[PDB]
Design a protein around this ligand. Structure first.
Ligand SMILES: C=CC(C)(C)OC[C@H]1O[C@H](O[C@@H]2C3=C([C@H](C)COC(C)=O)C[C@H](O)[C@]3(C)/C=C3/[C@@H](COC)CC[C@H]3[C@@H](C)[C@H]2O)[C@H](O)[C@@H](O)[C@@H]1O
Ligand SMILES: C=CC(C)(C)OC[C@H]1O[C@H](O[C@@H]2C3=C([C@H](C)COC(C)=O)C[C@H](O)[C@]3(C)/C=C3/[C@@H](COC)CC[C@H]3[C@@H](C)[C@H]2O)[C@H](O)[C@@H](O)[C@@H]1O
Ligand SMILES: [Mg+2]
Ligand SMILES: [Mg+2]
Ligand SMILES: [Mg+2]
Ligand SMILES: [Mg+2]
Ligand SMILES: [Mg+2]
Ligand SMILES: [Mg+2]
Lengths: 9, 233, 233, 9
């Protein structure tokens, strides 16, 4: 899916 | 707060331990306690705050999407209140975390943030957490929630364009997220694509000024912009 | 309890939704509420209970191991109370979850469980959660915690050998876990290896009696026994 | 690492 930042994990 | 008796430095140290242990709820609680000491945050501390809360709300959002999808299917043509109730429970918890983050930003991180790198960072976070509220909103305040996200992102954009180079990672990440806001919250895919493309191209042209380490940082977020453009075109 | 006002069937339904949403704390709270309705659990419901609490305590144990390792390094030859304090916080939370599970088993799941498949299942869980307590124990009660795990596993083993075929998945999983108990809690690696080997070999000889679906279930746990034997020899 | 069942995740 499309990216946003920060990301999780 | 429950962290009021712990030293600021100990809260920061424990937030870093919690990050190593993948205990993101604890990490976020430690960082909230550090913010509530009332002193400004360093760059590293801002990063810890944003990672902690993103991991908390990310799990909630993923769960909300699963439950929403089940609820949608159960309301198609062709099992009681439980799916709606549990989706609502997760939703309310998610809204609570967003309200907590927005409250830290409003009391008093944003008003004390004078340098571009801190002010843009906090305004981006404000846009992000209003955006998460917008993902679940349906009532009379939905348009105002969307506009609150937009207004925060726009102020951050204005500062970032005046005060930061086009390769600055905070500027790049802000553009990435504001572009996603345009695409999937504001129903403005053309604006989303235009923002991602101009951001990518302007960063490309400024890479020559960077050291190897800064080059690596900037190109990582540029690749996310490119990934989104590839998905959207 | 906080689930006292919710229907048993609704708790079970929500536990299944929570499992799909990867909300394991919620899943465990729903299953605790279902147990506290006072009725026996079906096979499927027992499985939900065990998966929910394993996921909760597994995250806590993983975090405890990370923090313990950091604490060990910080006490070698060559930074204050924070690492110990935070390890202790995670430890106390983990102990609380184990105490909760053990309390459900004692009030009153075990005493009402008359069929082998339920009695062995609950006694295995009792051994597992005393084992998790033993992983973190250091005081005057450590030996009694280890013996409580051993005694529960041993009763489950005795029933399983009398009442279940050697390929029964509960019997196999019990043997797998009791073998790990021997290896890393009781300092009895030879007993651990002997139990895993005899369990594997006796199950191999009984596979011919099974349907394709039962064969698949039994061989999956047999592969874990073999994996452990390969690690230990 | 060595296996026990149930597993997490
Ligand atoms: C957990 C926190 C610790 C370990 C302290 O730091 C995490 C990372 O913080 C820095 O990265 C930031 C950063 C990330 C980078 C893209 C990671 O890729 C590198 C090495 O660039 C992802 C994180 O979500 C974070 C903190 C968040 C943001 C967004 C914040 O929006 C409010 C804007 C873009 C980006 C910026 C701020 C990056 O500058 C370092 O430079 C990294 O080295 C380090 O991994
Ligand atoms: C989340 C729960 C739901 C979806 C209801 O069920 C999970 C699984 O429950 C059953 O498996 C059990 C089972 C597992 C199997 C090894 C999964 O491999 C299959 C398909 O055999 C792993 C789970 O930890 C569980 C519930 C736990 C145990 C241990 C419990 O110690 C107290 C003993 C061994 C094993 C037994 C009981 C398996 O019999 C089904 O047969 C599977 O099909 C299904 O995936
Ligand atoms: Mg102080
Ligand atoms: Mg709602
Ligand atoms: Mg067009
Ligand atoms: Mg009823
Ligand atoms: Mg202790
Ligand atoms: Mg020998």
């Amino acid at each position: 899916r499309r990216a946003t930042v920060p990301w999780s994990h | 707060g429950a962290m009021g008796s712990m030293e600021r430095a100990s809260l920061i140290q424990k937030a870093k331990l919690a990050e190593q242990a993948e205990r993101y709820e604890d990490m976020a609680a430690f960082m909230k306690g550090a913010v509530e000491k009332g002193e400004e945050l360093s760059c590293e501390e801002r990063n810890l705050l944003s990672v902690a809360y993103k991991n908390v709300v990310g799990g909630q959002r993923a769960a909300w999407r699963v439950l929403s999808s089940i609820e949608q299917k159960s309301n198609e043509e062709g099992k009681g209140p439980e799916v709606r109730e549990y989706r609502e429970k997760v939703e309310t918890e998610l809204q609570g975390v967003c309200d907590t983050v927005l409250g830290l930003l409003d009391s008093h991180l944003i008003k004390e943030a004078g340098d571009a790198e801190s002010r843009v960072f906090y305004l981006k976070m404000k846009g992000d957490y209003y955006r998460y509220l917008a993902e679940v909103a349906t009532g009379d305040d939905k348009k105002r929630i969307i506009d609150s996200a937009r207004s925060a992102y726009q102020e951050a954009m204005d500062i970032s364009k005046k005060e930061m180079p086009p390769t600055n990672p905070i500027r790049l990440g802000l553009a990435l997220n504001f572009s996603v806001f345009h695409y999937e919250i504001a129903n403005s895919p053309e604006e989303a694509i235009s923002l991602a493309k101009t951001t990518f191209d302007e960063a490309m042209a400024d890479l020559h000024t960077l050291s190897e380490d800064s080059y690596k940082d900037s190109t990582l977020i540029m690749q996310l912009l490119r990934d989104n453009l590839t998905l959207w075109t």
